[PDB]
Symmetry: C3
Subunit: 252 residues, 3 copies
Amino acid sequence: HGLDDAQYLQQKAHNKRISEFRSSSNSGINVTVVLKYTNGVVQVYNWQGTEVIAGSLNRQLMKFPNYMNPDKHGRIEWPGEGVEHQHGLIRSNGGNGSYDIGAGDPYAMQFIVQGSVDWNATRLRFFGPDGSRWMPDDQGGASVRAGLLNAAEDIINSKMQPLYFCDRMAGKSYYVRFDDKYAPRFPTIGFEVYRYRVGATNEMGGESARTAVASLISFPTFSTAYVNEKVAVENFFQPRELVYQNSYGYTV
Amino acid sequence: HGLDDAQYLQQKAHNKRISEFRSSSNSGINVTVVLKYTNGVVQVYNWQGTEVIAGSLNRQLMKFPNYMNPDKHGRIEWPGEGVEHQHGLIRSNGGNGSYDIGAGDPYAMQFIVQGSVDWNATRLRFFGPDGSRWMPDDQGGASVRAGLLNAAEDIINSKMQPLYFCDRMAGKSYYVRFDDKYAPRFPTIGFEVYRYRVGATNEMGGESARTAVASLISFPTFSTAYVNEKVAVENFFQPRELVYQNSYGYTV
Amino acid sequence: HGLDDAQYLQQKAHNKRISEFRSSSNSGINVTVVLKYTNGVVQVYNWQGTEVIAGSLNRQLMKFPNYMNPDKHGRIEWPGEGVEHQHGLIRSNGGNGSYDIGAGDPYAMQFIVQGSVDWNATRLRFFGPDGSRWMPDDQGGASVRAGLLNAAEDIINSKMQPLYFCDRMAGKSYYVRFDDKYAPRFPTIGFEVYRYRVGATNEMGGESARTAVASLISFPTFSTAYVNEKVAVENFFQPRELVYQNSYGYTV
């Protein structure tokens, strides 16, 4: 020895760089919403950002198919799951002529956050299909006069499960069923995710204001629907090195 | 007496809390755009936020049906109201083969703002179908070189009508016809609405910068189209406790 | 002489006002993305703003037709260019049953920025069809762990061509082919464009924070598709006084 210590060190320096770079304010943080349907389809929305990642999905995007991801025949609605159906979700007995639950009404979601993130600061907000603020403990959806838009329960960090990649925690995942218990049966969502900062300077304001504001919407949002989770994982999540928890509880 | 003063006080404390909570920076402010069509349909877009509410609608969303709200048959365009029609709106005599005015070209809008709002600061901006800045006094739509994006007339507060809920003013509404007089015949819109602050600390910046920026897009936008105003009011506005001025000038 | 010096001066004052107004923080800055298709179609997206203009397009909007601009028959997808096709773009050999290259997959884009702009500060970011960060020098699309979201090469100013209107430079244009050389063959994009400031006060923060943040999304985005560049120029760009470089290298 040591014949190849230089090659070894270079590989180590490469591994260190790539792993620690996640801490840079100029690396990416990822937020993925994965919607699950009773036919096995998963619909994926993936947002990226540097300092802040914020977004929402209304019922038009929570359902499948939709204008973003039509079905194989190019349809953005299914018979009996169109406007009349949506009206029956907005208001109890306010519908006409539709399936009671849509094949395209998701039954659960996985919310995955990855990167060097201020985990404690993550907000995930649930609303009813009409935009009413939904709260836990079965009080129903709140009106606009009574609705607290920033509730204690939006802070989901403690319920998120750590997802590891090699020896580091790469992200966290929250799995929830849409059953009117821990989330609405027909929810819409908003979320905010924030960069973990390694110093005290506020990079969302001051000399950083211009780029902070621009960064909110200057990264494309990826979306598609996959026939099943198996295909989604091999063709999207794995190659992007995005951690994901599968239907069996395993990190993949 | 007084046998039930405690129950009375508790109800009073409940009523006070819910009514005054609108003043909290963490309550919701609502902006609703209601588009009216000559077949009686109303198309609703409802934005919510805490400190700032901002948004826009281009012609693709000003018209009905569209990708957000297809018609009962799942169509996002009507024959003779498709691309050729849109081209004829963008530029005078720039179309081919389309209805002169679309059944799905709205004839009026109600712009409703509700919550504890800095009313004086509200902006509503009108643009032509091509994105040209539209100004009052019939000068036409302005080019990009001449277009003032923040005009005196964007400040619509004085033209808005107060809408009361019980003994308090809950919101304000502005009704306008799309007739090239007080608004374009084929408009597109942008708006900004701002929280009324009860103190001097700037919650859009400084220590509040990160959440201020995130809040711009972290609440889902509700949208649907209803067969008529009557149905919209009973199934959406009333239950959400959103004030709304009906076709007869009444607050409902 | 001079019989009409007053009329002359007034016209000169008018010309000076309109030309210099571009420098006002309350004038408009324009960003236009023009996508080019092998059937001659051009698809236009035009954003406006005062201090900052930021945005993105994912594959659903990079392609033609789409939910924003259906084809003449109202279709938002073409056979063999639907979900299966998109899957084959997201991941090599991850598709089934689709055209190898879509008629609706653009082959090039012109990115045009106009107004009083901090030219040096412009960012244009390229990503693959899966949202992977794309870098020059053929290293492929980067994973999320390794992806630098703000790279040196995002600063495209030096590659942009100046476009003049009369005696002033009105904007700059960047033309690029989607050929895996200087941009991805199947790209998605994000961009940030910033106001040139004539003073040192930061109008993206401080006392300007509230309007700065609101301005990010309070101007409608114009979009349409035109049968060819000739028609687009005469019916949209020319009347808006938006500079544009045609297929022959001429400013029009």
